[PDB]
Amino acid sequence: VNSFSGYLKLTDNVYIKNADIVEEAKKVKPTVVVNAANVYLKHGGGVAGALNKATNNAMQVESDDYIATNGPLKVGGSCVLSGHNLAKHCLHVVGPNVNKGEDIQLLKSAYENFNQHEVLLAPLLSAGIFGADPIHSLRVCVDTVRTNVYLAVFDKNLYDKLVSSFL
Numbered sequence: 001v002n003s004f005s006g007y008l009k010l011t012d013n014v015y016i017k018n019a020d021i022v023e024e025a026k027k028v029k030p031t032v033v034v035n036a037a038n039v040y041l042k043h044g045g046g047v048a049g050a051l052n053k054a055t056n057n058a059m060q061v062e063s064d065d066y067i068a069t070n071g072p073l074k075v076g077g078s079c080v081l082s083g084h085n086l087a088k089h090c091l092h093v094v095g096p097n098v099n100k101g102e103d104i105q106l107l108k109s110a111y112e113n114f115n116q117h118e119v120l121l122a123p124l125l126s127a128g129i130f131g132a133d134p135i136h137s138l139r140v141c142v143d144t145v146r147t148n149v150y151l152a153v154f155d156k157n158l159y160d161k162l163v164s165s166f167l
């Protein structure tokens with residue numbers, strides 16, 4: 001039993017809700033919140049910009065030190081950093097950005113990072129401003145993630161479309 005509330009159950013291990021991931025993280029304080037990151041951990045917009053704003057830019061400060069030490073992430077890769085005031089940990093995961101021409105096959109690799117954590121609050125990778133089809137992102141999620149994932153979909157209209165088209 002966990003503290004996530006109001007989710008629709010899609011499969012044995014995937015759950016979905018029309019919610020703002022920032023407000024959802026502040027309420028639940030999950031062990032892991034997933035950020036829709038880029039390789040430079042520049043949290044400028046989309047989910048990343050919103051999560052970082054909620055941390056009063058502390059996420060960005062921590063991320064800049066991480067990059068200065070370690071260099072950029074790989075597309076499809078991840079790193080674990082602090083969750084600040086939102087979660088115990090933030091798993092920064094880099095899905096491919098279609099508006100940068102990156103290989104969508106990397107989406108499966110990106111979701112594989114979720115399997116290193118028993119329970120996660122997450123957005124749909126490569127969705128929104130990353131340019132991929134969110135219905136496809138949800139399919140890859142269900143077919144790749146085996147741990148318990150709670151997906152927050154900001155847009156109510158998108159949320160309803162994802163539920164109604166789900167196979």
Ligand SMILES: O=C(N[C@@H](c1ccccc1)[C@@H](O)C(=O)O)c1ncnc2[nH]ccc12
Binds near residue numbers: 124130
């Ligand atoms: O969910 C968000 N963005 C994603 C998204 C996917 C599909 C359709 C539209 C947008 C995607 O752009 C991403 O960045 O993962 C988002 N963006 C800004 N502020 C936010 N506050 C809470 C959530 C949230």
